[model samples]
Each structure stands twice: as structure tokens, then as C-alpha cells.
Target: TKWLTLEVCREFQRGTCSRPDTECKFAHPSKSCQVENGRVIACFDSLKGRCSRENCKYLHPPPHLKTQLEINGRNN
Candidate 1:
């Protein structure tokens, strides 16, 4: 089975990535944000709440919190 992954701060993900006073960067899944890119992707955005599950433009979670959607199946 394939395991899930998290990109939270080193302190959160494990222990030691950035400074204690610094923040963490996360590219959550389900959105256009590419987790590999380490930044918000350009799949959806227009200065409006207008969005859909296809783009996840409405999900405005913590920009620094690197946490992907939780899943239990590999097919998902």
C-alpha cells in the first residue's frame, strides 16, 4: 500500500527544517498547488470566492501549513 505524505514544518513533520521563528511552506494536495513545486500553482485564482472541487480555489488554508488531504485508499 502507498503511504501518505506531509510537508509541515520540520518541527511538525519531524524535527529541523527552518528556524524556530520562521514559518513552513506547504503545497497541499487536491489543489493546483504542486507539492513538488513548493509553492501555490496557477490552476485557479481571480480575486474571488468563485471556485470548484476541480481547482480547490475556495480552500484557503494556512499558506505555511503543509498538510495534504487525508486518504485511506490507494485508488483515491
Candidate 2:
């Protein structure tokens, strides 16, 4: 089984502010504005501490597994 995780990276590409407001540069993740990067990179909010299993279900099997798969000489 595999679990999907979200990580965010902020790239600064402009002039620095004298009295920068930290609150203004933060990223907010919601149902409408979920962020994704290049190909496999998905971004989420860590500062807000607002992640749940329900939000990451897209990466898992729909029905989900009730028990772990046992290795029984199916493939090497």
C-alpha cells in the first residue's frame, strides 16, 4: 500500500521587502485551490496543519484494502 503526501516549496523571485509581512506570502490550500507541481509533486499546507486522509484519497485505491497483501510466490 502507498500513501500520498503533500509538500510545498516557495520560490522567491522578486525584490525583497523592507518591512515584509510574513502573513502575505503564505500559501493557502483548499478544495478549490489545491496546488500541484511539475508531474508528481503535490503541494499542501503545513503551517495551517489542515490535512486529512479524505483529502488524499485520490492517490489510493477506491475501495481500499482491508488487509495487507501476503507474498506467496506470485512474482519475484
Best by the TM-score measure: 1
Q: Write the per-residue lDDT of candidate 1 for residues 4-57, one digit (tens) a residue.
A: 233433243333445432243442334343443333332223212344456553
C-alpha lDDT of candidate 1 relative to the true structure: 0.35
Separate clash counts for every candidate: 0, 0
List lDDT for all candidates, in order.
0.35, 0.27
Q: Which stretches of model 2 miss by more than 4 angstroms?
A: 1-12, 21-76
RMSD of 2: 15.0
Residue 15, candidate 1: C-alpha displacement in angstroms: 12
lDDT against true structure, model 2:
0.27
**Which candidate number would show the highest lDDT if scored against the true structure?**
1
